[PDB]
Design a binder for this molecule. Sequence first.
Ligand code: HDE
Ligand code: HDE
Ligand SMILES: [S]
Ligand SMILES: [S]
Lengths: 726, 726
Amino acid sequence: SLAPEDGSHRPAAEPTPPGAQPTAPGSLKAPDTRNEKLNSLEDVRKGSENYALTTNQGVRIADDQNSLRAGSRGPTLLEDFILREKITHFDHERIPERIVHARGSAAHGYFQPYKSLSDITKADFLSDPNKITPVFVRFSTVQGGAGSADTVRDIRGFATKFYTEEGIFDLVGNNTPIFFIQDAHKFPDFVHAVKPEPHWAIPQGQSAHDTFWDYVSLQPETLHNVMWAMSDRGIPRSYRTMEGFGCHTFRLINAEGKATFVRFHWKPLAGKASLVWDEAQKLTGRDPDFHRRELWEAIEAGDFPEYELGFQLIPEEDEFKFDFDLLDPTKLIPEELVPVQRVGKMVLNRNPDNFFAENEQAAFHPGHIVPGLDFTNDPLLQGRLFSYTDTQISRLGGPNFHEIPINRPTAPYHNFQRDGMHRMGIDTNPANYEPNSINDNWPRETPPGPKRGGFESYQERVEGNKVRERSPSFGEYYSHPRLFWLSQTPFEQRHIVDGFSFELSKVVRPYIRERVVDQLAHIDLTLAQAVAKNLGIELTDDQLNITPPPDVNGLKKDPSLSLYAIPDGDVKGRVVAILLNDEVRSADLLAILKALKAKGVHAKLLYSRMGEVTADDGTVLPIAATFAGAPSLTVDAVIVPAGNIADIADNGDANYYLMEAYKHLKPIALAGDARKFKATIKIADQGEEGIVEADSADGSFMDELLTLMAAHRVWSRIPKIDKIPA
Amino acid sequence: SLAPEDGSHRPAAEPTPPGAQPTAPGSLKAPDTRNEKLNSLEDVRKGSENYALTTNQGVRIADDQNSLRAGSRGPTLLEDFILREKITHFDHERIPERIVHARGSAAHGYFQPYKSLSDITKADFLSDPNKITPVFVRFSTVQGGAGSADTVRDIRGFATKFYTEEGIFDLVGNNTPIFFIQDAHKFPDFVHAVKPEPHWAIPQGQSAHDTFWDYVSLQPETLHNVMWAMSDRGIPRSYRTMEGFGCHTFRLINAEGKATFVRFHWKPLAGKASLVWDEAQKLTGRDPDFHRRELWEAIEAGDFPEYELGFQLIPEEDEFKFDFDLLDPTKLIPEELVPVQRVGKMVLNRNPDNFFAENEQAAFHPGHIVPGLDFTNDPLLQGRLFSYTDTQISRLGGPNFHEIPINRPTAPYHNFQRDGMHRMGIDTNPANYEPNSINDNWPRETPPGPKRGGFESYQERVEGNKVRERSPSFGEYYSHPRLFWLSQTPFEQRHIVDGFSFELSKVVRPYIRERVVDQLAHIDLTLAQAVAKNLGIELTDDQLNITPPPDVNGLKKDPSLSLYAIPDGDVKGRVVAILLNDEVRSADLLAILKALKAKGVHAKLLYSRMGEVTADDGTVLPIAATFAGAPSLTVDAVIVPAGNIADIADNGDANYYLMEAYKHLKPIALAGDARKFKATIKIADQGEEGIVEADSADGSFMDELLTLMAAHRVWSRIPKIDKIPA
Ligand code: HDE
Ligand code: HDE
Ligand SMILES: [S]
Ligand SMILES: [S]
């Protein structure tokens, strides 16, 4: 026995808040959570307790500490098969990462619709509010490698595999409603431009380099998604607090054969929330795994990520009723024009057991549709259909990638396909072709119908010549960027300007920065002047006189485009740093934790060392982390209880903690003598909005702090931060 | 034409300092830097200017902006082969990354010996000081993926491929002289324990997690290399400023067949220098590509990385003359006992053209030796010899990885091996076996001899039974950790304590922390006590009474094991930040830049925005980056000239620049009214060692600053930084 006698090596198999226990594989941490897909993976789950260590051939190993040698200081012998198996498996552990979205984090859950949608789609998973469909969801960045950092500025992927009774449906979305380019033929161009440059393979996880901005300046169709990426949308607080979108118009097909155009939405029920850029960048350094960790810890604590699936629905006869083309994936459909209809709820409630086997090996692909859904001619979607099947032949080693356990349907699958590398299924059918008589033609085709029918494409009319041509209707590039900009709050606008400015400051060739500023002048003059000023660029008289693009279908803003214009805060699952001293006032701490508990807000107790300290009244307080070990970047607010403040008052790290949190617009609360820290962040004696202060930590002190947390950040503080050296 | 009229898109093909020009592929940046290997790659280099865009089959493309569709808003057609080839290639761009050392950065150069070594080795590349051998060198971290950050705390790899006239010799080393484990059979255990944990794949690029310290606590053989990793060895300033080691005793074999034991060394002619932990960690977020960038830019500037190759030579009859086993790779050979003989110099003078083709596909392997070298029974080297050939079969797709251009020998190669995936060589030999008559037995075996002979192993005597057993002589784990400890300066010792303390505070299971502290008590009580205090652990009476391990062959320290005990500073190729204002005193700047140029030190001119400012005398000064865009993390020292200081006096970012540089022990120099900044870093009116100040930037001011820079950091400042909130 190497485990400690008190059993403190094994995490509690029950919900526990972040940091309370070591994290564990999902089937050990939450054995009681189940769904149909988790149950079906049981055949390949492997345990360990009480088993002998063996080769992969089942031979027990006696000594796993030494190679076989001729004498104990001699050479290693070729006959050591146990060594060579073990090192050969090690030597071949890695598979190619995904060409894009290589960095991602995943969990299991389930989906249910609020009511049957049979009047608009025959898709089985949407036919009955009692039908529960297991899901597996992977969130991701786009540009960086599997080993890159989470809180980079980038677009985020949001891919859901629905294991339906009529096949796998993968909804392969992102956290913005559009993409940078119009036609799939340019995807390698755009992706090569944003990826590390090919001579030296720099930079990782960043669009802040010459080739990205060269491409953008030369391809104005990109400006809409670039506006999103440069906003705080590019730096979400959590995968739990971002929106998801299906990116294209698809179709729903009902049993009558009626097509309705649809765009897909995910609404985060935890609300929308983003970091600020200096915080996101610094966090890539202090914890490059912060989003993967926050997602896994949320599920272990029971703060299950929840999302509402929604549909924007457009009748077929309304195809041409807008100012933009519905097939143009650089255009959004404003919610003011077409509201999102709520469809159902998805909950993510179980982590995987083994990251490589369930996360790294999962394959999502938007061609994976089911009866009741269909495509459209969006020319970016159209090319996606080719890529997601193709790429798996190298990434997952061949055409049997659907036999890798996480990718297996739970629906029946039978057909005449055979062989390929890694073939698991042993087919007993006497036939491997159809039509056949020797197996009475089974498995058999199934006609389309209202349920459980075969897939048939909607009979869309096609007319035109074979051309490599962009539709003229896609040739408008500035109105949607302008609608987005005008929909932002003034502080969201400032952060857009600061994102273009920082990024273009990293472009070495100045003419590329000038060309991008020229494009901005076509969108909005105020935005363009503000960026130009930060770059030392002066707009020409011609630039100052560019007519702004038209409004989109009479709209001059749509508030659903803003993260923050309309409050949608939720504090459950947020975290507060509590800065301790060597003689904490226990009554303050009891009131702080009581109020945080009641709203499902977590806490981390921090000090200048590990171990414990003892409160004024003898209560032993266990320290979670040092000030330096768990920086303010990792929390949503900071509370300092009263007590022996002298203990930490001249501690550089403790003062800096509050300066960093202050700069990043987080709520800060100081009780009693902790008010002494007001001097480090230059707060006046009469106080200021966003700093909660009182003689003790209750009556209204925690209500005030929790009201600040529900509004996420203290935006009114922005003018005060440029003066603080932090 | 899309390029700017003024030609400013194209970097000059001359050496230029960092930031002066965009970086470029090495054959375009330095077209006349040549060596036998670079010239031999010309057969596969492809250019681009003035050529038409084609498929891979040579068909010219007319429209590389669109897919082929039926109508300009129609579906994409399967007959679009141009689209499918382009997206197929993109879909399969990625290959598996290296199992370990996936993150690395590489360059070309050459090696030449100082004298003939024929008396001790018949290796041809060491036979004459006129023998110039091309090299390709890849530096790397160990744990993180190819997209992880450079300035993590980790061991670093230093792998050199010598293209000799008698074969490739790969010297595949690290930046410490030992490894964590004794026997190759435990490599996958150790690497699994340091790598991200298997449930959730966290953390990236860090040993600061429970499974690493669990293994270390249970395997005290690891403690010696753990001491090195927790020292500032684990966070080098540059690949140019760290040592390399071949890790194992190999043999040199001379023409007479005499074997001498050898351990290999690389000594950096730029001297030894490392970051401090806070700076390294923050730098992973501010610039995760910092070491890759600094290496590429150094070579572009002509600050070519230079290392001296060195041998520790031990006669065969001296095998048992030490109190440790020469075959145990957890033991170092102290230079006080066996000096390093300096044998030649390697210079890296050219970056690659295409990172993936030359860096990512390069394969190094320590079994790639040449006549005049041989192995020993070191049980970690023995197992390595299996792994480095095996792993390439998945990583590089098959057994023809020596035909990938960067890997090809420049020496002749001819044999009877045939076929394999993507076989390039077309053999004309009528025979593919030997002995054969039908080609008169060619290519033929060559007997061993003094030059141009075949390889024959040294006829070492082997006597023993077939056993899986560790030599009892390997069973001592504490004397080398203690020697290394006692050889460090008092500030290097504090940084080791801090590295253990920070790492163990991130281990969630407290008994693992306790088990590590127990091991520390076996090494040195002062170290053990200092770590324990940071963790809130108290040593037991038994722990306080553990007898220290013995000295190593009577040594109680060896200053060659310290980074800084013996002065070894070189400022050429270092970089200073100069913080501008909107009316700079020009005389200060002329003097600063003149003195920096004379010593080969670079500068970066920083301000609050991009563009330019104008000095008091109307000199226009171009701005390289903002204060926030290029933080103090990225420079060796900071200089603030006089002028309109009030322009920046209340700039939070400018104040913080100096606070962060101060906290990180960097020299800071303040001229005239720039001395008003003393107040932000709490410098007394009378001054402080490490802060250069004068009325102006005269001759003595720069000499003082450059003297501080030769000493790298201001270690005497350490007691003052605890109070600084930065
Ligand atoms: C023609 C335009 C085009 C093309 C060709 C592609 N992409 Fe992807 N994209 C591919 C190609 C690849 C290369 O096949 C790849 C690489 C690995 C793989 O299996 O598929 C992939 C990954 C990917 C994920 C990760 C899924 C996971 O977590 O495993 C997510 C969420 C998205 N995508 C989302 C997405 C949207 C939202 C609408 C839009 C638009 C696009 N993408 C554009 C697009
Ligand atoms: C049994 C003990 C053992 C075993 C089995 C291995 N390692 Fe490695 N190591 C391998 C295995 C692999 C898996 O073959 C792999 C992974 C991909 C590959 O092709 O080779 C590899 C890479 C590697 C590089 C990068 C070279 C480059 O830039 O590509 C460097 C610099 C080092 N190593 C240095 C090193 C030292 C210096 C002493 C010592 C000791 C060891 N290692 C220990 C060791
Ligand atoms: S999209
Ligand atoms: S080693």
